[PDB]
């Protein structure tokens, strides 16, 4: 009848897409990169330890100047740190103790936060006198805020645990666009270098590529076997890396529209919470649930080093725009800056 | 480098005030206890709130100590992600309507949810205070010919009331037997893999006025004492 035909058509389309993807699999990255000299061994030491948070930290974000950074903890605090001198530039108390994400504006005049209140709060840091106060409260999501990234000082893209993403205009306070299509909570998002596209990973073992202007999904990637927690673009914007609860990382290309490389090992049976790239994209840094961080050769898929200085879950990880240092946060309420 | 010295000094006395304020706030943070109120709409979860928008706040004072209760609302029924945010609360209050023993199977769903919460890897240290609401409705349904307990729990007919059971006066053995069977269903899961790091505290509540906050206070005191006794290789 009317039903049971759409399902068969969808299955046929899935088979056609799979065949088209298979027809493009000329070779593999490992075969091509056989002549590449190995990276070797990466030995990083903790250059700074930042203390002052009372509860576990979920989020951090570097500044464009590669010197200041914001961190969010469920003690009810956003702390803005100077990395070079380990001082404290700002301390902002939050109306809701439950915060899951934080962002830092590229200009540096604003920060953003959100969590188990379905509201994104924007904080102005360049007031003429007084202190930091809420300038905008974007509301309308029906689920907890998972991630938020700034586009200029008037636009922001947020992901929510209501299976939808949103693009908001800050001045009016109304969301310009809604991105639908995921069947699970959207856990992370990453902006392209040109800020024209972005990618999101959901709790359905899938990732999607969205165009900001049109508001529609262009490509979908399904290689993982469990929930996706982290996602990050390659420096040139033609690829991206994802991490999940199945304990593997995967590199997906956009032109080829399929997976290129997998980063996993037999002795790792814990999920991956954070993903980041190096300045040149040669090293891929991943935070794990076993209280450790790993460094992978992004072209040869062999582990190159371990960041082992945290006593609890590693929740957030970030690399500066200069590429000099890597900052990691954990559930033990300390930040660590490595070089 | 005079300007550099001046700005560095300004940074130092800007950090000093922030650190002083953080030291002041640390005492307030350490001196209050966070409770996670869970359950379902059918199970009540609001009459508890009555006698003390994505989350709701409640605050109450017991013997001059602070308690904060967190009601999770306006959230989807996928709790496998946002539950991890409540892994350092002192207690999870789990409210279950034991009268609805006849989705149409509330007790089995509650048992499965309790098992999932108990066996979570990030909730291995969190204790649960179990409230079994609507006992009068359960008594009325058991006394009347509404439904049979062993239609969903066939092992009930082989259950004998434990000797330690102390029912409230003016009762019938059937309602006591049903209540203790339901309670032991949760106690089995609690005792299967507790390993001494956390416990479960089951209570029977019908209409008690301001006694629920007293029960929560006593159970939190017990939780803290047991944690202190365990860390000293003494319990």
């Amino acid at each position, epitope marked *: 009848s009317e039903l049971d035909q759409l399902r068969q058509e969808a299955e046929q389309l899935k088979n056609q897409i799979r065949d088209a993807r298979k027809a493009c699999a000329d070779a593999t990255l490992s075969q091509i990169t056989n002549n590449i000299d190995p990276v070797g061994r990466i030995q990083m030491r903790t250059r700074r330890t930042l203390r002052g948070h009372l509860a576990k930290i979920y989020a951090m974000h570097w500044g464009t100047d590669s010197r200041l950074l914001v961190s969010a903890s469920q003690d009810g605090k956003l702390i803005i740190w100077d990395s070079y001198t380990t001082n404290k530039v700002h301390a902002i108390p939050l109306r809701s103790s439950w915060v899951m994400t934080c962002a830092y504006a590229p200009s540096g005049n604003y920060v953003a936060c959100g969590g188990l209140d379905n509201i994104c709060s924007i904080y102005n840091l360049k007031t003429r006198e007084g202190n930091v106060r809420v300038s905008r409260e974007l509301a309308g999501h029906t689920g907890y805020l998972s991630c938020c990234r700034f586009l200029d000082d008037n636009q922001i893209v947020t992901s929510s645990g209501d299976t939808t993403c949103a693009l908001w205009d800050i001045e009016t306070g109304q969301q310009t666009t809604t991105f639908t299509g995921h069947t699970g909570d959207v856990m992370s998002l990453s902006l392209a270098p040109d800020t024209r596209l972005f990618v999101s990973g959901a709790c359905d073992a899938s990732a999607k590529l969205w165009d900001v202007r049109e508001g529609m999904c262009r490509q979908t990637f399904t290689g993982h076997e469990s929930d996706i927690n982290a996602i990050c673009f390659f420096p040139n914007g033609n690829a991206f890396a994802t991490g999940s609860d199945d304990a593997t990382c995967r590199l997906f290309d956009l032109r080829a529209d399929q997976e290129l490389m997998t980063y996993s090992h037999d002795n790792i049976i814990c*999920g991956i919470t954070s993903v980041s790239f190096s300045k040149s994209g040669r090293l891929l840094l991943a935070g794990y649930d076993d209280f450790n961080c790993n460094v992978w050769d992004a072209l040869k898929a062999d582990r190159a080093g371990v960041l082992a200085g945290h006593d609890n879950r590693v929740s957030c990880l970030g690399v500066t725009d200069d590429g000099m240092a890597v900052a990691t946060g954990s559930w033990d309420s300390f930040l660590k800056i490595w070089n | 480098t005079e300007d550099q010295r001046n700005e560095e000094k300004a940074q130092r006395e800007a950090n000093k005030k922030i650190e002083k304020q953080l030291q002041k706030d640390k005492q307030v943070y350490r001196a209050t206890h966070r409770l996670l109120l869970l359950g379902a709409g059918e199970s009540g979860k609001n009459t508890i709130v009555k006698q003390m928008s994505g989350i709701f706040e409640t605050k109450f004072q017991v013997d001059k100590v602070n308690f904060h209760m967190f009601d999770v609302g306006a959230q989807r029924d996928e709790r496998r992600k946002w539950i991890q945010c409540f892994n350092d609360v002192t207690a999870i209050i789990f409210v279950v309507a034991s009268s609805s023993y006849n989705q149409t199977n509330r007790l089995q769903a509650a048992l499965k949810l309790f098992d999932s919460i108990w066996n979570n890897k990030w909730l291995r240290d969190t204790s649960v205070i179990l409230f079994l609401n609507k006992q009068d409705l359960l008594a009325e349904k058991v006394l009347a010919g509404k439904s049979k307990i062993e239609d969903y729990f066939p092992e009930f007919a082989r259950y004998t009331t434990p000797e330690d059971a102390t029912p409230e006066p003016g009762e019938d053995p059937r309602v006591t037997r049903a209540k203790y069977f339901i309670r032991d269903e949760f106690l089995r899961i609690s005792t299967a893999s507790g390993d001494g790091r956390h416990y479960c505290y089951p209570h029977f509540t019908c209409a008690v006025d301001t006694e629920n906050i007293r029960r929560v206070f006593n159970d939190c005191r017990d939780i803290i004492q047991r944690m202190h006794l365990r860390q000293y290789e003494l319990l």
Partner: nanobody
Framework: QVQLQESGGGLVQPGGSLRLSCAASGFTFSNYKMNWVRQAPGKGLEWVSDISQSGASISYTGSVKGRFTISRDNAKNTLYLQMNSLKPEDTAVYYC?????????????????????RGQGTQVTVSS
């Protein structure tokens, strides 16, 4: 792409038997604990049974103990449910649900209205 395809079902006289098969692809079958869930007409999802990675632990609800049986073949990546004695209250759509994550002792969201790692389901009716 994780795929769970259910088989079996149909119309069966009271007292009859049915064998339901769940073919799983796209993930490592050995590392996950599997569940059989069902939804009756005009009702919600009900957990029916579950089995662990190696089959050591098996659980049922009180309305199916003694009658229903669950098993898994890890070599062929298949989940089997055998229904020996059937009743008019067993008319429902049966789904084959999967644990959200591997190597975990818990399963949070398998009877939810929406859930990613669940199959289409098969209709089973026992009327006359």
């Amino acid at each position: 792409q994780v795929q769970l395809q259910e088989s079996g079902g149909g119309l069966v006289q009271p007292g009859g038997s049915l064998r339901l098969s769940c073919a799983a692809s796209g993930f490592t079958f050995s590392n996950y604990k599997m569940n059989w869930v069902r939804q009756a007409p005009g009702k919600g999802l009900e957990w029916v049974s579950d089995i662990s990675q190696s089959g050591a632990s098996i659980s049922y609800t009180g309305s199916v103990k003694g009658r229903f049986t669950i098993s898994r073949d890890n070599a062929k990546n298949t989940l089997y449910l055998q229904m020996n004695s059937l009743k008019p209250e067993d008319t429902a759509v049966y789904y084959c649900a999967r644990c959200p994550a591997p190597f975990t002792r818990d399963c949070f969201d398998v009877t939810s209205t929406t859930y990613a790692y669940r199959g289409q389901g098969t209709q089973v009716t026992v009327s006359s």
